[PDB]
Amino acid sequence: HVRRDLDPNEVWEIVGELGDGAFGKVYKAKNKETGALAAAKVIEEELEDYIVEIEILATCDHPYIVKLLGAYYHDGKLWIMIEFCPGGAVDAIMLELDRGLTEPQIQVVCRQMLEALNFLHSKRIIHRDLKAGNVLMTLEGDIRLADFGVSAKNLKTLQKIGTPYWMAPEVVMCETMKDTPYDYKADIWSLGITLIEMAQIEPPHHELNPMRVLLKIAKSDPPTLLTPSKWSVEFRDFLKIALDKNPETRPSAAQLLEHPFVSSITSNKALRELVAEAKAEVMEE
Amino acid sequence: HVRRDLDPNEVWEIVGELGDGAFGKVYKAKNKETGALAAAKVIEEELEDYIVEIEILATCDHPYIVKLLGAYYHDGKLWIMIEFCPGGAVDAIMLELDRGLTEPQIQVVCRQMLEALNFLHSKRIIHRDLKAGNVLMTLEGDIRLADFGVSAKNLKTLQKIGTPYWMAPEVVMCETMKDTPYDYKADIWSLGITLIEMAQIEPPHHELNPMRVLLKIAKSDPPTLLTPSKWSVEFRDFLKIALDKNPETRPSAAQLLEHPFVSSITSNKALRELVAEAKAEVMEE
Ligand SMILES: Cc1[nH]c(/C=C2\C(=O)Nc3ccc(S(=O)(=O)N(C)c4cccc(Cl)c4)cc32)c(C)c1C(=O)N1CCN(C)CC1
Ligand SMILES: Cc1[nH]c(/C=C2\C(=O)Nc3ccc(S(=O)(=O)N(C)c4cccc(Cl)c4)cc32)c(C)c1C(=O)N1CCN(C)CC1
Ligand SMILES: [Ca+2]
Ligand SMILES: [Ca+2]
Ligand SMILES: [Ca+2]
Ligand SMILES: [Ca+2]
Ligand SMILES: [Ca+2]
Ligand SMILES: [Ca+2]
Ligand SMILES: [Ca+2]
Ligand SMILES: [Ca+2]
Ligand SMILES: [Ca+2]
Ligand SMILES: [Ca+2]
Ligand SMILES: [Ca+2]
Ligand SMILES: [Ca+2]
Ligand SMILES: [Ca+2]
Ligand SMILES: [Ca+2]
C-alpha cells in the first residue's frame, strides 16, 4: 500500500496547513490532475507506526471512516494522503458555534459512529482514541471517524508476558483485555463519553488535570448527563448501558444499534443542518 | 555492554549443551584463560530484545541474581555469557529427588528470593516470570534468579494508549498496572505460587490446560497449600498475604522480609544440604 514506484509530488500539491502539534504538521493537499483535496502528512525507525496506520486505513474502506487516497515512500519522506472533510472536527464545530449539539444531531452522530465501530470491530480493529475531535464532518452531514495513530501504535505492539500458572490475577486480566471479546469494549465506553462531550461541549472531569482524571475514571461511578431533564430517557438509558464499568457486561456496537436512541434514525438531516450552520457561522466577519 | 572490539571465541570455548527449546540452545562454555564456566547463548531485528536483556543483566549485579560475565557482537552472532550454576534449577532438583522441598529449604529460597526482588524492584525491574525453573542453585546453597527474557521483552515495549478523559476504566487500570507501585506486585504473587510449586512439586491448576488456567486464576480464590497440617502457620500466613488478588493491598518484598516465615532466616544450610543430596542422587547409576 506504500507506493515506491511513483513520485508523489507529480500527483499532489501541498496548498495549505490544516494543523500542527505533537505529531507534526497536517497539510491540505490538492490533486493536480483531478482537483480533489486531501489531508496530508509528509513525514521525514518510527515510520513502522505510520506503516501499520496506512495498513489499517487501507483496510478501513467504509462510508463513515476516513478514506486513504494514497501512501508513498519517495526520496526519503513518507506521504500519506487521506480524504479532506470540509465540515471539520465536531469539537471545532462546537467551539465555533459556542454550543453543544442538539439531541437529534447527537442521535445521527451516534448511529453513524456505531455503524463505523461495528465495521472496525468486525475487522478486529480497535480505535482506542474516540473523542469529538476525531469525528470529522462532510458537507452532506456524514461523519468520518479519524486518527488511527493510537490504534496503529497499539496494533504494532500486539503484532510484535509470563508463564500462565505463575501469572498474577491482574496480569491475566490485562492480557485478557488485549484480545476478543474484551479489547473492542473500550471503544463503546469512549463512544459514551464522546456523546456526553457533544451534549456538554466538555467531557466529564474536564476540570481535573490528566493524572487526576485517570484516578477519577477508575474509582468514580460512570458519568451521567449534567442536566438530565434536557434529554430523552432514551439518551440517558443509552449512556447508562454503554458506560458500564464492567467490560464483560458492556454491550457491543451491534447490540447498541438496536437501542431505541438510534434504532429509528434513518436520516442525516440534523447533521447536514449543523454543518450548514457552522459554515455560515465561520463566514461571519 | 555489548563488546564489539574483542573477538569472543578467543576468550570462551563452547564445551557442551545445557538445554534447548523455543528460545534456542543454551550452551555450557569454559573460559580458556581462567577455567570459569558459563551458561551461553550464541545468537545468529529481535536482537534488541537480547540487547535490553543484557542491559538488565548488567544492571543486576547482586548475590542472588545471575551474574553477566560477558556480552559480545562479533562476526554477525550475539554472544551472551552468564555465570554457570552447578546446582541446577530447583524444578530439576525436585524431579531428580522425586519430592518437594522441606519447609526449612523453602524458607531459605523465600528469604533469598525476597532479597533479590527487593533489589530488582529498587531498580524498577520487574521479573514477570518467576517459577521454580528460574531459581537456580549454587553448590554453596544459594539461589540465583534467572531468565530475564520476559522481563526484557516487557521493558523493550515500555521503553518504546488514548486520551485520558475518554479512556475506559479497564484501560486506565491496565495502563496504571504498567507503572509503580503496581507493576512490581505481580512478582510477589508469582513468588507465592513458586513457593507452592516447591512445596507440592507442581503449581496450582497444573491439571488444567494453559488457557483454562488463565480463567481459573482470574475467577478463583487465591491458592492454598493442599495439606495445611504439614506446614507451619507462618508459611500458610505468608501465602495468605502474598497471594492477595488485589495488587493495591499486596505487600512489597520489603514488607515480606519482616514476615516471621523469613525474618529469622540467617543461614543457607538447609539449601546447601538439598544441593548436596541432589548431586549425590544424580551420581546414582
Ligand atoms: C477542516 C478540517 N479538516 C480536518 C482534518 C482532516 C480532514 O479534513 N481530513 C482528514 C483525514 C484524516 C485526519 S487524521 O486525524 O486521521 N490525521 C491527523 C492524519 C492526516 C493525514 C495522514 C495521517 Cl497518517 C493522519 C484528519 C483529517 C480538521 C481537523 C479540520 C478542522 O476542524 N479545522 C481545520 C480548519 N481550521 C480553519 C478550522 C478547524
Ligand atoms: C545445571 C544447570 N544450569 C542451568 C542453567 C543456567 C546456568 O547454569 N547458569 C545460567 C545462567 C542464566 C540462565 S538463563 O535462564 O537466564 N538463560 C536461558 C540464559 C543463558 C545465557 C544467556 C541468556 Cl541471554 C539467557 C540459565 C543458567 C540449568 C537449567 C541447569 C539444570 O538444571 N540442568 C542442566 C543439566 N542437566 C543435566 C540437568 C538439568
Ligand atoms: Ca468513502
Ligand atoms: Ca464563533
Ligand atoms: Ca485531529
Ligand atoms: Ca477542553
Ligand atoms: Ca428519542
Ligand atoms: Ca450568525
Ligand atoms: Ca455568531
Ligand atoms: Ca555474583
Ligand atoms: Ca532420580
Ligand atoms: Ca531455564
Ligand atoms: Ca509439570
Ligand atoms: Ca517457621
Ligand atoms: Ca540414593
Ligand atoms: Ca534414588
Residues of chain B with Cβ-Cβ distance to A181 below 8 Å are none
CA–CA separation, B106 vs A134, rounded Å?
A: 55
Name, in order, each residue with C-beta under 8 angstroms of A113's C-beta and a sequence gap of 6 or more. A64, A130, A135, A143, A145, A191, A194
B147 is annotated as contributing to ligand binding: no
Q: How far is CA B268 from CA B230, B235, B284, in A?
A: 22, 18, 25
Name, in order, each residue with C-beta under 8 angstroms of B196's C-beta and a sequence gap of 6 or more. B203, B204, B223, B225, B239
CA–CA separation, A133 vs A219, rounded Å?
A: 26
CA–CA separation, A211 vs A279, rounded Å?
A: 36
Q: Which of B29, B43, B99 is nearest to B72 (CA)?
A: B43
A105 DSSP β-pair partners: none
CA–CA separation, B250 vs B189, rounded Å?
A: 8
Q: How far is CA B186 from CA A21, A172, B152, B213, in A?
A: 37, 10, 15, 17
Tell me the pairing of strands A12-19 and A143-145.
unpaired
Tell me the pairing of strands A26-31 and A78-83.
unpaired
Residues lining ligand 1, CB < 6 A?
A 18-19, 26, 39-41, 53, 66, 80, 82-85, 88-89, 92, 136, 146-147
Q: How far is CA A285 from CA A143, A242, A280, in A?
A: 27, 41, 11
Strands annotated E in A23-62: 26-31, 37-43
Amino acid identity of residue A2, one-letter, is: V
* Cβ atoms A53, A62 nearer than 8 A: no
Residues of chain B with Cβ-Cβ distance to A218 below 8 Å are 169, 172-173, 176
What b/e readout covers B211-223, taking b as 16+ CB neighbours within 10 angstroms? eebbebbeeeebb
CA–CA separation, B54 vs B19, rounded Å?
A: 20
* Cβ atoms B65, B127 nearer than 8 A: no
Neighbours of B143 (CB within 10 A): 27
CA–CA separation, A108 vs A141, rounded Å?
A: 9
CA–CA separation, B172 vs A220, rounded Å?
A: 12
- Residue B90 Cα, ligand 10 centroid: separation in angstroms? 19
Asked whether the beta carbons of residue A168 and residue B189 sit closer than 8 angstroms, the reply is yes
The grid coordinates of residue A189 equal 465506553
The grid coordinates of residue B6 equal 574483542
Name, in order, each residue with C-beta under 8 angstroms of A124's C-beta and a sequence gap of 6 or more. A180, A184
> Catalytic pick from A129, A142, A183, A187?
A129
Amino acid identity of residue B95, one-letter, is: L
* Cβ atoms B267, B107 nearer than 8 A: no
CA–CA separation, B169 vs A212, rounded Å?
A: 13
- Residue A203 Cα, ligand 6 centroid: separation in angstroms? 8
The grid coordinates of residue A153 equal 501504535
CA–CA separation, B201 vs B210, rounded Å?
A: 17
State in Å, rounded, how far the first CA of chain A is from the last one: 43
The alpha-carbon gap from A217 to the nearest alpha carbon of chain B, in Å, equals 6
Helix (H), strand (E) at residue B52? helix B47-59
CA B93, B97, B102, B105 dihedral sign is negative
Atom 1 of ligand 2, residue of closest alpha carbon: B88
Amino acid identity of residue A108, one-letter, is: V
Ligand nearest to the CA of B98: 11
CA–CA separation, A203 vs A194, rounded Å?
A: 7
DSSP A136: E
CA–CA separation, B231 vs A70, rounded Å?
A: 68
Q: Give the nearest partner residue to A165 out of B176, B206, B247, using CB atoms.
A: B206
Residues of chain A with Cβ-Cβ distance to B177 below 8 Å are 170-171, 174
Q: How far is CA A249 from CA A179, A194, A215, in A?
A: 16, 20, 22
Tell me the HSE value of A255 on the side-chain side, using a 13 A CA sphere: 9
Q: Is A219 exposed, middle or buried (0-12, 13-18, 19+ CB in 10 A)?
A: exposed
Substitution candidate for ligand 2 out of B17, B37, B66, B73 with most atoms within 8 A of CB: B66
∠ CA B265-B268-B273 to the nearest 5 degrees? 130
CA–CA separation, A224 vs A243, rounded Å?
A: 9
Has A129 been annotated as catalytic?
yes
Helix (H), strand (E) at residue A13? strand A12-19
The grid coordinates of residue B87 equal 546446582
CA–CA separation, B162 vs B168, rounded Å?
A: 9
Amino acid identity of residue A93, one-letter, is: I
Amino acid identity of residue A282, one-letter, is: V
3-class state of residue B34 by DSSP: coil
The grid coordinates of residue A195 equal 456523546
CA–CA separation, B105 vs B195, rounded Å?
A: 10
Taking every pair of Cα atoms in chain B, the longest distance, rounded to a whole number of angstroms, is 68
Amino acid identity of residue B183, one-letter, is: D
- Residue A284 Cα, ligand 9 centroid: separation in angstroms? 7
Name, in order, each residue with C-beta under 8 angstroms of A276's C-beta and a sequence gap of 6 or more. none
Tell me the pairing of strands A37-43 and A26-31.
antiparallel
Amino acid identity of residue A107, one-letter, is: Q
Q: Give the nearest partner residue to B169 out of A182, A194, A245, using CB atoms.
A: A245
Helix (H), strand (E) at residue A78? strand A78-83
Q: Which of B194, B199, B192, B208 is nearest to B227 (CA)?
A: B199
Q: In what order do the strands lie in the sheet with B37-43?
A: B12-19, B26-31, B37-43, B78-83, B68-73
Q: What is the dihedral of CA B109, B152, B190, B67, to 10 degrees?
A: 0
The grid coordinates of residue A234 equal 432514551
- Residue B96 Cα, ligand 15 centroid: separation in angstroms? 11
* Cβ atoms A64, A112 nearer than 8 A: yes
Report the CATH fold assignment for B1-84. Phosphorylase Kinase; domain 1 (3.30.200)
CA–CA separation, B13 vs B24, rounded Å?
A: 18
CA–CA separation, A159 vs A180, rounded Å?
A: 15
CA–CA separation, A168 vs A215, rounded Å?
A: 22
Neighbours of B58 (CB within 10 A): 13
* Cβ atoms A281, A227 nearer than 8 A: no
> Where are chain A's structural domains?
1-84, 85-285
Q: Give the nearest partner residue to B177 out of A166, A170, A217, using CB atoms.
A: A170
CA–CA separation, A42 vs A17, rounded Å?
A: 12
Q: What are phi and psi of A47, to 5 degrees?
A: -80, -20
Peptide bond into B181 cis (omega under 30): yes
B38 DSSP β-pair partners: B29, B83
Q: What are phi and psi of B251, to 5 degrees?
A: -70, 160
Name, in order, each residue with C-beta under 8 angstroms of A96's C-beta and a sequence gap of 6 or more. A278, A281, A282
What residues in chain B have their Cβ under 8 A from chain A's Cβ atoms? 128-131, 150, 157, 160, 162-177, 182, 185-186, 188-190, 193-194, 197, 203-206, 210-211, 213-214, 217-218, 245, 247
Residues of chain B with Cβ-Cβ distance to A150 below 8 Å are 162
CA B74 and chain centroid, separation: 29
Selected residue of B166, B172, B198, B202 to mutate for chain A interface (largest A Cβ count, 10 A): B166
* Cβ atoms A274, A141 nearer than 8 A: yes
- Residue B98 Cα, ligand 16 centroid: separation in angstroms? 8
Q: How far is CA A186 from CA A216, A248, B138, B235, in A?
A: 17, 11, 48, 41
Neighbours of A206 (CB within 10 A): 11
Q: Which residue, chain included where needed, has cell 440534523?
A: A270
CA–CA separation, B53 vs B41, rounded Å?
A: 12
Tell me the Ramachandran region of residue A205: left when phi exceeds 0, alpha when psi lies from -120 to 50, beta otherwise.
left
Residues of chain A with Cβ-Cβ distance to B197 below 8 Å are 165-166
CA A133 and chain centroid, separation: 8
Helix (H), strand (E) at residue B46? none
Resolution of the experimental model in angstroms, please? 2.0
Name, in order, each residue with C-beta under 8 angstroms of B129's C-beta and a sequence gap of 6 or more. A162, A163, A166, B147, B149, B150, B151, B190
CA–CA separation, A209 vs A216, rounded Å?
A: 10
Q: Which ligand 2 atom sits closest to the C-alpha of B134?
A: 15
Architecture in CATH of A85-285: Orthogonal Bundle (1.10)
What b/e readout covers B108-117, taking b as 16+ CB neighbours within 10 angstroms? bbbbbbbbbb
Q: Is B59 exposed, middle or buried (0-12, 13-18, 19+ CB in 10 A)?
A: middle
Atom 15 of ligand 1, residue of closest alpha carbon: A147
B29 DSSP β-pair partners: B14, B38
Q: What are phi and psi of A101, to 5 degrees?
A: -80, 155
Q: What are phi and psi of A259, to 5 degrees?
A: -75, 140
Q: Which residue, chain included where needed, has cell 506503516?
A: A51
Q: How far is CA B133 from CA A1, B262, B274, B283, in A?
A: 45, 21, 16, 21
Peptide bond into A251 cis (omega under 30): no
CA–CA separation, B115 vs B109, rounded Å?
A: 10
CA B257 and chain centroid, separation: 18
CA–CA separation, A254 vs A252, rounded Å?
A: 5
